[PDB]
Amino acid sequence: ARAKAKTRSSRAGLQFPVGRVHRLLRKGNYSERVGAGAPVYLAAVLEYLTAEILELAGNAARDNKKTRIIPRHLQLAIRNDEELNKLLGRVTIAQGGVLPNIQAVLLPK
Amino acid sequence: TPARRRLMRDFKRMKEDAPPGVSASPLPDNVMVWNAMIIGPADTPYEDGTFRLLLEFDEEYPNKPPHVKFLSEMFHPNVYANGEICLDILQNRWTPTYDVASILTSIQSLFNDPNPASPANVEAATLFKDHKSQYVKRVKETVEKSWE
C-alpha cells in the first residue's frame, strides 16, 4: 500500500521500456555505475530511430499496395533514405534484395 | 605419404643402428606409435636403468614437434614427473632434420649433462644442485624402481 507503480517509460512519455534499457546497461559491463537519465535518453533515441524506419517502410509498403511490412520494404526504406543508408551501410538484411538500378551505359539507344 | 616414408626410414634406423643404451621401434600396425626404453648411460647414477618411453607420432612429423612420453616415472630438474621432458628440440626448437636416433642420443646425453636452466621439477633441481647426496640416493632408488 505504498503507491500505484508508474513506469519510467510513461513518466517520460515513451513507448520503449526504460527499465529494460537500464537493466541491459547495468549488466552489460559498460561502466561501474549508470546514471538515472541515461536509460531515458537511450530509450528515446531508440524509439525515434524505430519510428523513422517504420514510417519509411510503411510508406514503401503502401507504394506496393501491401498492408504488411516485409523485409523488402525495410531494405527499400533504408537504401532510399540518405541518412539511414549511411547509418546502416555495412548491414545485410535477410530477404531484402537490392535497389533496382541499371547503369545508363547498358541501356539501349 | 612422405611422412610415413620418413617414419619407415626411422624404423630402419632405430632397428639397425640403435645408439648405445637406447632403443626405439614403431608398431608394425602403426608406425606413428613407438614404445622405447633407454639403458642408463655410463658415468651416471642413472646408469643401466630401464627407463621405458612411449613415443606417438602424427602426420605433422617432422614439420611440427611431436610428443614423447615416458612409460617410466621421472624425477629430474628438466623432466616433469608425468614423463614429460623440458626440452626445446621437441618443445621450442623443433627441427625436421632431427630423427628418432638423434633425439634418443640427445636424451641420453642430457642424462650425463642436465640443463637446470630449464627447470621442470623444482624439487629435483634443488636436490641435484644443493643436496647432491640426497639427489644421488633418490636417483638410485628411482633407477632401482625402474628395474623393478
Binding site: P71, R72, A94, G97, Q103, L106, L107, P108 | -
Partner: protein, 98 residues
C-alpha cells in the same frame, strides 16, 4: 519463321527480374554440401543448424552481388560492357581484400 530477340534484350529483362525479387539464387543443397566440405578442414564430424547454413548463404549472395556491382563499375570504367576477371581483381584490390 523462328523468333529471336537481339542479344541484350533478355539480359536486360532478367536484370530487371532479378533486381525486383528477393529469393536465393544459389541452389540450397549444393551450397550446403560446399559449406560442409569447407567445414571439414577445421573440425571433423561437425553438425550444422539449418538456420546457420541459411545465414551463411544469405551472407554469400549479398557479398557476391556487392562484388559484381563493383566489378560492373570497373568494367564500365575500362570502357566496355563485358565484365572480365581483371575487373574482379581490381575491385577486390581497391576494397582491400587482395
Amino acid at each position: 519463321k523462328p523468333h529471336r530477340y537481339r542479344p541484350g534484350t533478355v539480359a536486360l529483362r532478367e536484370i530487371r527480374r532479378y533486381q525486383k525479387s528477393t529469393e536465393l539464387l544459389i541452389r540450397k543443397l549444393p551450397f550446403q554440401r560446399l559449406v560442409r566440405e569447407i567445414a571439414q578442414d577445421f573440425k571433423t564430424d561437425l553438425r550444422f543448424q539449418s538456420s546457420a547454413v541459411m545465414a551463411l548463404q544469405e551472407a554469400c549472395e549479398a557479398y557476391l552481388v556487392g562484388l559484381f556491382e563493383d566489378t560492373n563499375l570497373c568494367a564500365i570504367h575500362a570502357k566496355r560492357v563485358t565484365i572480365m576477371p581483371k575487373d574482379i581483381q581490381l575491385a577486390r584490390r581497391i576494397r582491400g581484400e587482395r
